[PDB]
Design an enzyme around this catalytic site. Structure first.
Site, mmCIF file in Angstrom:
data_model
loop_
_atom_site.group_PDB
_atom_site.id
_atom_site.type_symbol
_atom_site.label_atom_id
_atom_site.label_comp_id
_atom_site.label_asym_id
_atom_site.label_seq_id
_atom_site.Cartn_x
_atom_site.Cartn_y
_atom_site.Cartn_z
ATOM 1 N NE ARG A 203 21.571 152.151 -6.292
ATOM 2 C CZ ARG A 203 22.410 152.340 -6.657
ATOM 3 N NH1 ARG A 203 22.452 153.566 -6.977
ATOM 4 N NH2 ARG A 203 23.679 150.947 -7.920
ATOM 5 C CE1 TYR B 120 18.933 150.629 -8.704
ATOM 6 C CE2 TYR B 120 20.722 149.685 -7.660
ATOM 7 C CZ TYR B 120 20.064 149.876 -9.056
ATOM 8 O OH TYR B 120 20.955 149.822 -9.557
ATOM 9 C CB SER C 156 24.776 157.146 -7.606
ATOM 10 O OG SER C 156 23.951 156.890 -8.033
ATOM 11 N NE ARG D 297 27.066 158.413 -13.699
ATOM 12 C CZ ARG D 297 26.746 157.038 -12.663
ATOM 13 N NH1 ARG D 297 27.201 156.679 -11.489
ATOM 14 N NH2 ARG D 297 24.664 157.099 -12.754
ATOM 15 C CG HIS E 133 15.120 162.493 -3.448
ATOM 16 N ND1 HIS E 133 14.718 161.884 -4.165
ATOM 17 C CD2 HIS E 133 15.649 163.517 -5.373
ATOM 18 C CE1 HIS E 133 15.089 161.534 -5.763
ATOM 19 N NE2 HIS E 133 15.502 162.423 -6.030
ATOM 20 C CE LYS F 75 21.732 159.668 -8.779
ATOM 21 N NZ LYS F 75 20.885 160.600 -9.715
ATOM 22 C CD1 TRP G 108 14.175 150.475 -14.016
ATOM 23 C CD2 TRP G 108 15.151 149.870 -11.982
ATOM 24 N NE1 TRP G 108 14.893 149.300 -13.789
ATOM 25 C CE2 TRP G 108 14.918 148.569 -13.600
ATOM 26 C CE3 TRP G 108 15.862 149.886 -10.869
ATOM 27 C CZ2 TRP G 108 15.154 147.203 -12.757
ATOM 28 C CZ3 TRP G 108 15.682 148.636 -10.498
ATOM 29 C CH2 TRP G 108 15.906 146.849 -11.712
ATOM 30 C CB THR H 82 16.360 146.267 -19.336
ATOM 31 O OG1 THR H 82 16.329 147.153 -20.302
ATOM 32 C CG2 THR H 82 16.033 145.170 -19.265
ATOM 33 C CG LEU I 48 7.105 168.156 -3.952
ATOM 34 C CD1 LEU I 48 5.586 168.708 -4.004
ATOM 35 C CD2 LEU I 48 7.224 167.061 -2.431
#
Ligand SMILES: Nc1ncnc2c1ncn2[C@@H]1O[C@H](COP(=O)(O)OP(=O)(O)O)[C@@H](OP(=O)(O)O)[C@H]1O
Ligand SMILES: Nc1ncnc2c1ncn2[C@@H]1O[C@H](COP(=O)(O)OP(=O)(O)O)[C@@H](OP(=O)(O)O)[C@H]1O
Ligand SMILES: [Cl-]
Lengths: 286, 7, 264, 7
Positions: free
Chosen positions: A101, A178, A109, A112, A78, A23, A28, A215, A55
């Site tokens: 981040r 981020y 995040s 959610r 990750h 997250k 992006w 974006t 991976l």
């Protein structure tokens, strides 16, 4: 001719790791890379996946990134840098791009994405307190790396950003926040592209177009339009899935879960754990 | 699928 | 002999059963929960989930289960370290239905069961659900042929689920002898390991595991009946017929179906 | 929410 209606549907070669804790804006960045590499705006998830490997996805089929690539190879993970699979790439690794981040925002995040609504007081409180208790998401046995392979946030950060001359002797390492990308996408993405050294002058116009193609708005369209997945429109209730492209917010307060949770979080931030150390180092501790 | 509008 | 012993099979071919018997044999203790089985043999795909891997230079016999085709890159790491391949095969009719049951699809849900069978037939396997499996013929071929190439140092044994079912003691004895787990093989202990692993014992193991959460085999029951050569007529004659067509050609599917006595 | 449209 009436308007405003809705349709009725009824080293130059070698591995470049795009590594991050879940997250942190990995998708992006990969979207901007795909747009930049191809000079075309990605339209569906598969356009993004076509330009960088994942991976964990590969591992699911017994597949592996090439151990002796004759080209730059972009691979997302990750997993902590010290898992045995990554040790196969000790020498073949040319670049580490590590995205970090604000843990507040990763927490929310992840929540959610776990289908926990801020309306579900019990589940959201439970989730947030587990995150704080465990200094991240490595408690979730069902999440990436089985939790264990992901580690806590500081464990993940440490593995990718420290003693890099030991783990990946032939690699350069760049850590990118981020939040810094959000701040000035073109400048920071051009630094990412220059760092990854995929070949040739970074054309700021190509960078600008790649950013424009990726974006939040373009990626929301991408999500709706897809195609692939980020990991059959309008089935029943059970067919709903959490929105992958959210708002990309910064330094969100946890107060809405209860001021006590926010207070617990602050306790963590200003303690003496590795979590607090990294939060301070990356400007997330206030 | 994937629509949409707004006409 | 040091080195990896692969317990390889396409899904639903009786792999957990053999692993249970192996655990019982190696430990000399009747497995009581899933963890007793998993304690005795590694699972490749479970390990990969953590970015972990079986040792490439093993200093002892190591049992590892996988459903992946032998030719995927991960298996390529084990060319030298591989000592034995045990490959289990089972009637694809029964793998199809076992798989369908474990996907929580009811036999009388006409659309979902039919769709599932069609996909099995169209894809000649379960490699759509992932591509690491391959089709059944691809998987069978990968493990049972050109083993002199993939695993130059390994011996290979293929056993039918159905033959295990027909004479567990004789067949498991062959497995244990093949795997070379140290020392002469005492038939009494083959018999005891088989007894600890019957359908009844394993159903009990399943229940017991569930009351303790003593592991998980991967809600549909994992231990079923082990039926043979089940008709697909209930799904519809077009589907049974489509399946039979697979058996009657000269494709890889037909070849291996004939070879292992599954072609009727 | 989480599912799309429009109907
Ligand atoms: N185009 C984008 N610009 C900025 N952030 C984005 C973009 N696309 C996705 N993200 C964000 O990146 C986060 C997901 O990151 P990963 O792809 O690492 O998973 C989400 O953050 P949020 O849940 O706090 O909103 C996601 O919205
Ligand atoms: N002790 C056992 N003896 C025979 N078959 C078994 C035993 N335990 C499990 N199986 C069968 O082996 C099959 C599952 O095999 P896996 O390779 O997934 O392990 C199931 O078959 P079915 O669904 O057709 O019944 C399962 O019932
Ligand atoms: Cl319309």
């Amino acid at each position: 001719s009436s308007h405003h209606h809705h349709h009725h549907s009824s080293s130059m070669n070698g591995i470049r790791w795009i590594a991050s804790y879940p997250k942190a804006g990995n998708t992006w960045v990969r979207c901007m890379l795909a747009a930049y590499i191809t000079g075309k705006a990605p339209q569906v998830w598969n356009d993004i996946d076509a330009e960088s490997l994942t991976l964990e996805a590969m591992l699911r089929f017994g597949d592996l990134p090439p151990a002796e690539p004759m080209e730059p190879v972009l691979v997302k993970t990750h997993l902590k840098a010290d898992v045995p699979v990554l040790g196969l790439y000790g020498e073949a690794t040319a670049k580490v791009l590590y995205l970090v981040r604000n843990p507040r925002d990763m927490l929310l995040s992840s929540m959610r994405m776990a289908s926990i609504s801020r309306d579900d007081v019990e589940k959201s409180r439970d989730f947030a307190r587990k995150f704080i208790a465990n200094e991240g998401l490595g408690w979730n046995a069902l999440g990436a790396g089985g939790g264990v392979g992901l580690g806590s946030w500081p464990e993940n950060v440490r593995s990718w950003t420290e003693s890099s001359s030991d783990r990946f002797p032939n690699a350069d390492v760049l850590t990118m926040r981020y939040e810094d990308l959000k701040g000035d996408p073109v400048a920071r993405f051009s630094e990412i592209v220059e760092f990854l050294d995929l070949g040739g002058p970074v054309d700021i116009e190509d960078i600008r177009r790649a950013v424009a193609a990726s974006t939040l708005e373009r990626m929301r369209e991408l999500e709706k339009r897809s195609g692939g997945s980020p990991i059959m429109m309008k089935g029943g209730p059970g067919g709903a899935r959490p929105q992958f492209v959210g708002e990309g917010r910064y330094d969100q307060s946890l107060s809405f879960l209860g001021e006590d949770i926010e207070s617990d979080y602050q306790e963590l931030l200003h303690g003496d754990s590795g979590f607090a150390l990294y939060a301070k180092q990356y400007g997330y501790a206030g | 699928x994937y629509x949409x509008x707004y006409x």
